[PDB]
């Protein structure tokens, strides 16, 4: 079933808000927001809300968000510094799926809004997250224009896609490989941009289905989209070395130089959950397959 969305009613100087984790009273125009979703951080920047941001997970701050490098840190996306959050005295904390498990602890500190994406309904959830944040600040007009521009980009990207080619999405960690299909955390490649999948039913898991290079060759993708989690975790291994092997070399993707190394900060950290990231990621795909 679809994830429950964020819903809100206007309460004068505040909103009454419900999402899939719970209910909150959120002040209008919140002044001190701790943001633990990197995509939503980029939406705050797109909406010119940088001064509302009181703290960010500096351990995982992407290259494309370095304008937030002066903000107080609240740790990393997987290493949340609850003391730092408390010390910032936020009026609102914004989380996604990585921090759901700490919901009760965060809500003790301040109202806690969940903005995770629904992998089965990416665009609907994406719009709900953007427009909910925009509603808090009265920025619906600006947000809607930016969403309309993204939808136009989606159409332009779709128009260049080759109906007869198929792709596989993989993730590398350590010297290991895992795979992702349609309606996964990386599913927009298939679900929104219409690139065909080599396998419609790849076993779901947060960090993917363990596979070997024999599987890659068996599926013989035209494109391989690679997300190197090693870069995010600080491990020394790299995808370019893992995939330089005799099995992968026999794929159409290798033979046509269509092993595409996706920017892991966008794909794995932001997850396309921002006005900036999603636009940039659509272009990244388009330019890789045109
Ligand atoms: O809830 C999540 N992960 C919890 C994992 C807890 C146990 C393993 C922790 C050590 C391994 N993970 C990392 O060291 C890591 C570091 C930065 C960002 C990540 O996403 C990471 O998994 C999670 C949710 C959505 C997307 C993700 O991807 C996640 O993980
Ligand atoms: Fe993770």
Author numbering: 21 to 310
Give the published text.
The periplasmic binding protein (PBP) CeuE1 is an important component of the Fe(III) uptake system in Campylobacter jejuni, a commensal Gram-negative bacterium in the avian gut, but a common source of food poisoning in humans. CeuE, an integral part of the CeuBCDE ABC transporter of C. jejuni, is responsible for capturing Fe(III)-siderophore complexes in the periplasm for delivery to their respective inner membrane transporter. C. jejuni does not itself synthesize siderophores, but capitalizes on their secretion by other bacteria, such as E. coli.
The linkers between the two catecholate binding units are well ordered, with B-values close to the average value for each structure, in spite of the linker pointing toward the solvent with essentially no contacts to the protein. The longer linker of 8-Lic is notably well ordered considering its length and inherent potential for flexibility. This tolerance of longer linkers can be rationalized by the lack of protein contacts observed for the linker region in the structures. The structural differences can be quantified by calculating the mean planes defined by the six carbon atoms of the two catecholate rings, and measuring their inter-planar angle which is 97°, 111°, 110° and 110° in CFe-4-Lic, CFe-5-Lic, CFe-6-Lic and CFe-8-Lic, respectively. In contrast, the longer and more flexible linkers in Fe-5-Lic, Fe-6-Lic and Fe-8-Lic can adapt to both the geometric requirements of the Fe(III) center and the binding pocket of CeuE. In addition, the affinities of CeuE for Fe-4-Lic, Fe-5-Lic, Fe-6-Lic and Fe-8-Lic were determined using fluorescence quenching, which yielded dissociation constants of 21 ± 6 nM, < 10 nM, 33 ± 8 nM and 58 ± 8 nM, respectively.
